[PDB]
Subunit: 126 residues, 4 copies
């Protein structure tokens, strides 16, 4: 898997003393960005071409909480890649333990229209 | 449905010029809270008993974006209610149009253990 | 003063069990947006005139915390209005107690350049 | 100065295409946490000693914007250290340009009461 390792910041918690559920999606976005950066085609360069990566749906299942200052890892895997869309899966680990699992499906946009994924992008995703 | 009506704030947008996907989960939480408040058993009073409502999983599908200052409505429906858990469904409307759909499943916790849903809570959920 | 009323949402808290200090600036932004809307000249209309209101500096003094589900008011007052800038002050009240005080200073841009505040905009600020 | 390095995440931007002003206070919090960790006395350890660091006031002056994917540094400096309070200042640099300047003032509590800053804590702040 591609691994993104991250520490919980205080502002990411809520009054329950855990990381708020909505912030997991932010962590997944950070992981996707580092995935692309690490492969040498950062999302920022995609945006310079006039490409947008559009989120279609997202799912997260929450098994155990994350606390302030916990070190955790998001292990990302490409699940599906078609002409128009791609799907990532994510497992969030803390110590030995899967603390959450998720997935996100995406498509791509240029000049206000859905475009098939450029071969240059297929290369880094694959 | 229970209806929650809300306007998009500037800080809820990102550089794509849309509401960031993670904020939809925050909007659903606001809707759940107003649902309970409106039925006269706000979540805050549940927390005073020493009850926690725990999110198990969440899903959102994104059909059309929301923009800064858009007025939108979250229409909430109780989908499932068992001894231990409950599931809400959500449709986000803007003007005539379903802009996203979602669901969240929850359970309840007291004194570090999963508890069956108190009859008082069943009453307001139903 | 212009009065903006608001309830604290659960995601606005952190593990300290209080509203995270950064969110106060979001509440002030909401208050400014409601003030401009009340005047019949929402910020969205300004954006449709190729204008941006740019924040110069911000300060907040935190006296007492806000907790999840607290109802509070933000009292907004214009402090300064000049050719190019304006300054608002804010007092956040909970029940009849001042819980925080703040101020923000702003200017306006068009075409990536600083413009004199349009006369139509001075009219609603004053 | 203590140097904290950071990259802008997409969710930290707003529709203006810049980092929302409220997020700067989150970056400063991250910088403080890294400073304390570097000293072998993370804030999490303080929490395990029934202590809380409470923010008194905060100020930020915004000179130039940060954009999505910008790498920047926060230079943290202790400005004041007294029996009960301490003050940090911050300069945010992008490339070699100061983009923002700020400061935060803090005190410490235990049992819901203000305590003198422990000697062990003064030792790592100084």
């Amino acid at each position: 898997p591609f691994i993104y390792r991250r520490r919980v910041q205080f502002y990411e918690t809520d009054a329950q003393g855990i990381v708020h559920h909505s912030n997991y999606f932010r962590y997944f976005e950070e992981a996707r960005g580092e995935f692309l950066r690490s492969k040498g085609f950062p999302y920022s360069k995609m945006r310079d071409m006039g490409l947008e990566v559009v989120l279609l749906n997202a799912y997260c299942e929450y098994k155990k909480p994350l606390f302030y200052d916990d070190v955790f890892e998001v292990h990302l895997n490409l699940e599906e890649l078609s002409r128009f869309t791609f799907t990532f899966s994510y497992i969030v680990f803390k110590e030995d333990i899967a603390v959450a699992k998720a997935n996100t499906k995406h498509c791509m946009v240029k000049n206000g229209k859905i475009v098939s994924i450029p071969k240059e992008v297929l290369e880094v995703l694959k």
